[PDB]
Design an enzyme around this catalytic site. Structure first.
Site, PDB file in Angstrom:
ATOM      1  N   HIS A  30       0.817  -1.222   0.000  1.00  0.00           N
ATOM      2  CA  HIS A  30       0.000   0.000   0.000  1.00  0.00           C
ATOM      3  C   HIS A  30       0.847   1.267   0.000  1.00  0.00           C
ATOM      4  CE1 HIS A  30      -3.093  -2.962   1.267  1.00  0.00           C
ATOM      5  NE2 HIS A  30      -3.712  -2.363   0.258  1.00  0.00           N
ATOM      6  N   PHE A  80      -9.121 -16.015  -3.845  1.00  0.00           N
ATOM      7  CA  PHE A  80      -9.320 -14.590  -4.116  1.00  0.00           C
ATOM      8  C   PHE A  80      -9.927 -14.380  -5.508  1.00  0.00           C
ATOM      9  CE2 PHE A  80      -6.867 -10.441  -5.246  1.00  0.00           C
ATOM     10  CZ  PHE A  80      -7.793  -9.597  -4.670  1.00  0.00           C
ATOM     11  N   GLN A 134      -4.551 -17.070  -3.724  1.00  0.00           N
ATOM     12  CA  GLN A 134      -4.739 -16.415  -5.015  1.00  0.00           C
ATOM     13  C   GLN A 134      -5.876 -17.048  -5.795  1.00  0.00           C
ATOM     14  OE1 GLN A 134      -3.550 -13.298  -5.608  1.00  0.00           O
ATOM     15  NE2 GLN A 134      -2.939 -13.762  -3.519  1.00  0.00           N
ATOM     16  N   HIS A 150       1.363   1.301  -5.799  1.00  0.00           N
ATOM     17  CA  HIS A 150       0.017   0.727  -5.857  1.00  0.00           C
ATOM     18  C   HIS A 150      -1.018   1.819  -6.246  1.00  0.00           C
ATOM     19  CE1 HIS A 150      -3.693  -1.167  -4.793  1.00  0.00           C
ATOM     20  NE2 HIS A 150      -3.906  -0.276  -3.829  1.00  0.00           N
ATOM     21  N   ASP A 174      -8.727  -1.276  -8.162  1.00  0.00           N
ATOM     22  CA  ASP A 174      -8.057  -1.672  -6.920  1.00  0.00           C
ATOM     23  C   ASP A 174      -7.868  -3.211  -6.854  1.00  0.00           C
ATOM     24  OD1 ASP A 174      -6.856  -0.830  -4.503  1.00  0.00           O
ATOM     25  OD2 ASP A 174      -8.719  -0.929  -3.375  1.00  0.00           O
ATOM     26  N   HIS A 184      -6.666   7.120  -2.680  1.00  0.00           N
ATOM     27  CA  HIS A 184      -7.420   6.054  -2.017  1.00  0.00           C
ATOM     28  C   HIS A 184      -6.668   5.272  -0.935  1.00  0.00           C
ATOM     29  CE1 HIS A 184      -5.683   2.866  -4.440  1.00  0.00           C
ATOM     30  NE2 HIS A 184      -6.314   1.969  -3.687  1.00  0.00           N
ATOM     31  N   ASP A 185      -5.319   5.277  -0.907  1.00  0.00           N
ATOM     32  CA  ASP A 185      -4.536   4.550   0.119  1.00  0.00           C
ATOM     33  C   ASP A 185      -3.481   5.413   0.830  1.00  0.00           C
ATOM     34  OD1 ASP A 185      -5.500   1.878   0.448  1.00  0.00           O
ATOM     35  OD2 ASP A 185      -4.533   1.223  -1.417  1.00  0.00           O
TER      36      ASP A 185
END
Ligand SMILES: [Mg+2]
Ligand SMILES: [Mg+2]
Ligand code: NA
Ligand code: NA
Ligand SMILES: [Zn+2]
Ligand SMILES: [Zn+2]
Ligand SMILES: [Zn+2]
Lengths: 412, 424
Positions: free
Chosen positions: B173, B385, B382, B177, B331, B213-214
């Site tokens: 983050h 996800f 992964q 990113h 994202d 956003h982060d």
């Protein structure tokens, strides 16, 4: 496929096939009304929650299976579930404190006989009356140290949103928790949460609205992204003050009890945001429609959701209780309410901002506002509360009607 | 009276009269199949509802009823008008340098409008400042500096401080990113199916939301912040802790000297942009994933397309539902990138999770799933996800913008199968 689209499509085919005499025509009319009302009464978020809740339970099934597969399948299920799913003078004070359990106890006299510390005086009386210090292992020193700092963080130079208003809401919440219709409904933890939410619900209030804080690009509005700015701040201060030396009144609760109380308190103080009024009223109204009451008159609230909907409405009703108090008390609250509005008007003037409707003595219609406030907000809320706890709250409702008629008769 | 109850009682009455009203083998079959369908529809209507969906229908009704009363009251007198205004406002809710690295940067930036841009190379050729480099490229490509009267100095002053407020010692983050999400959002905004749909202000809002956003991410989850009783969790009352903080920092940085990139917008434009940005960054909270998915799915079902046929989004609500899904999809775009890029993102997200695990160990806390560097099932994670979160989202996005994003979907499936084949 989203659930609401599915239901509507199947209801549309039922209607299409129904068409394929007086009874047949009157029912098609009733079906067409209900189907139209189903669509129109829906919003973007109501439609959304049906679908997201469905999607959440679909994933929760798929992970419960994955968890049973291996130690790997279990940590993958735990990762995904946690990330992508949700959840002298003392003699006079003792005399006033005899009315602790009564609606319309004179809190103005409590302030006068407590060296202008009504919040500490009333909270200590409530905690002793309800035996909360013994139940939750709170030493008196811890309690008074916390209450004193909490009271110190209420602004003295703000006419309405000060410790006297907090003392009043805490005392009113204490009386509402004692409603006979609500006997044995709440746990000791829920009682603790409600009285604490009531005491902290306005701490560090600057004497200006959330809209003033948004319009002036305040640090507070910036920090809280324009959403329940004040209500979020009241909670942050309230919980932060527990970190002061010898002030952690929740130090001897279990970790689970502090997690539960914290969740309930956040929920209750966020519900005091006036712009959420219609949501609380809608929740309270659905509760009245489906109410299950005992032969002796006691309400049945089976699950947490029902209990928190009632508690969040109780603290909101306590916050909107000034018009339900004796005229002598109510008239003093209206003066303070007005003085604070005018004080915001002064701050708008110094900033060159458009002066708010009730924020100026030359244009504020004090009496008509009290009648509008009662007719549109206070009476609909208290009438719904009275239906839920019938016959308790009738005196509250009678006092309200008298005060409304008095203000109406006082319109110039 | 609450409206859903009223509708429910009405449909129940229709059903109890349908039974009275009900060669003719086909009639009986039609009469019985429709009653069973009605009963199924009524059962599903009740069960598919929640406390908040039912109350939402009632509060909206109450808000409209009061608004009608207050509009009439505002016409009565100057007093009625200020009383209506009080009640409505309170109780209702509404030069350039010539270097080898610069030549290499210009070469990478040729892929600006492509899903295939390598942001790792952009970072390497821009003195590890991918966010400033990519945002300046996007703003020039889209002519946003001219449209919104943003001087390059103001823009670069803001972007540099924004990038400085992304932590370098956080593996995932960080500004790399953010640059990736901003670039991916820029590409998604250019989808042919979404041509001329968004205003210049909406485009400005989406790219800005993606960049901020982060910001100031500590490299630990909201749940870690809640469990450790952090200042941040305390300040934000345990709700979207990080997402609220990202917005507060992002908007606060505009107050820095000569950094107000929104200084030459009208007051109304700033109000609208601010509302859209808050909305988009709050939607990046991963726990809100199913709500966004729900919104995107309803949008697909009711989608209207012109002769072109470019998507039609009539009102603001439709527009913001697409935009917050776009930033969320951007994202969650790492598994949709070429394997070489995706493998580098997975290493970084794992490294960050493990850094958190070290913090939980030093604090005597129970180690979070995926945070133990000794027990993490990287490949299976992964696959989970993708199967449960990334593929359902991207499949819904692809349905909305068909046929664009078919290549995104093809890659996702390849990367999923690669990770599946790599499970030890
Ligand atoms: Mg308040
Ligand atoms: Mg994030
Ligand atoms: Na004070
Ligand atoms: Na940095
Ligand atoms: Zn001490
Ligand atoms: Zn209050
Ligand atoms: Zn991100």
């Amino acid at each position: 496929v989203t659930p609401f689209a599915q239901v509507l499509a199947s209801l549309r085919s039922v209607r299409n096939n129904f068409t394929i005499q007086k009874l047949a025509m009157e029912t098609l009319e009733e079906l067409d009304w209900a189907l139209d009302q189903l669509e129109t009464i829906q919003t973007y978020r109501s439609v959304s929650e049906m679908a997201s809740n469905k999607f959440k339970r679909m994933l929760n099934r798929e992970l419960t299976h994955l968890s049973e597969m291996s130690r790997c399948g279990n940590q993958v299920s735990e990762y995904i579930s946690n990330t992508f799913l949700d959840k002298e003078n003392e003699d006079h004070l003792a005399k006033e404190l005899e009315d602790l359990n009564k609606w319309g106890l004179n809190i103005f006299n409590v302030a006068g006989y407590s060296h202008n510390r009504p919040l500490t005086a009333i909270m200590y009386a409530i905690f002793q009356e309800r035996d909360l210090l013994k139940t939750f292992r709170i030493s008196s020193d811890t309690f008074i140290t916390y209450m004193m700092t909490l009271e110190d963080h209420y602004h003295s130079d703000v006419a309405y949103h000060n410790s006297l208003h907090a003392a009043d809401v805490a005392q009113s919440t204490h009386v509402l928790l004692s409603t006979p219709a609500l006997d044995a409904v709440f746990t000791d933890l829920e009682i603790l949460a409600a009285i604490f939410a009531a005491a902290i619900h306005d701490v560090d209030h600057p004497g200006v609205s959330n809209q003033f804080l948004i319009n002036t690009n305040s640090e507070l509005a910036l920090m809280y992204n324009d959403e329940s700015v004040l209500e979020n701040h009241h909670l942050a201060v309230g919980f932060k003050l527990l970190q002061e030396e010898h002030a952690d009144i929740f130090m001897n609760l279990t970790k689970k009890q502090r997690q539960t109380l914290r969740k309930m308190v956040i929920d209750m103080v966020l519900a005091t945001d006036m712009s959420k009024h219609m949501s609380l009223l809608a929740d309270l109204k659905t509760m009245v429609e489906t109410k299950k009451v005992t032969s002796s008159g006691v309400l049945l609230l089976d699950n947490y959701t029902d209990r928190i909907q009632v508690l969040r409405n109780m603290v909101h009703a306590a916050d909107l209780s000034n018009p339900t108090k004796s005229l002598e008390l109510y008239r003093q609250w209206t003066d303070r309410i007005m003085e604070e509005f005018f004080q915001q008007g002064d701050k708008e003037r110094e900033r060159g901002m458009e002066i708010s409707p009730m924020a100026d003595k030359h244009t504020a219609c004090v009496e008509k506002s009290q009648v509008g406030f009662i007719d549109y907000i206070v009476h609909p809320l208290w009438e719904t509360w009275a239906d839920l706890v019938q016959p308790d709250a009738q005196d509250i409702l009678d006092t309200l009607e008298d005060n409304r008629n008095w203000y109406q008769a006082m319109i110039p």
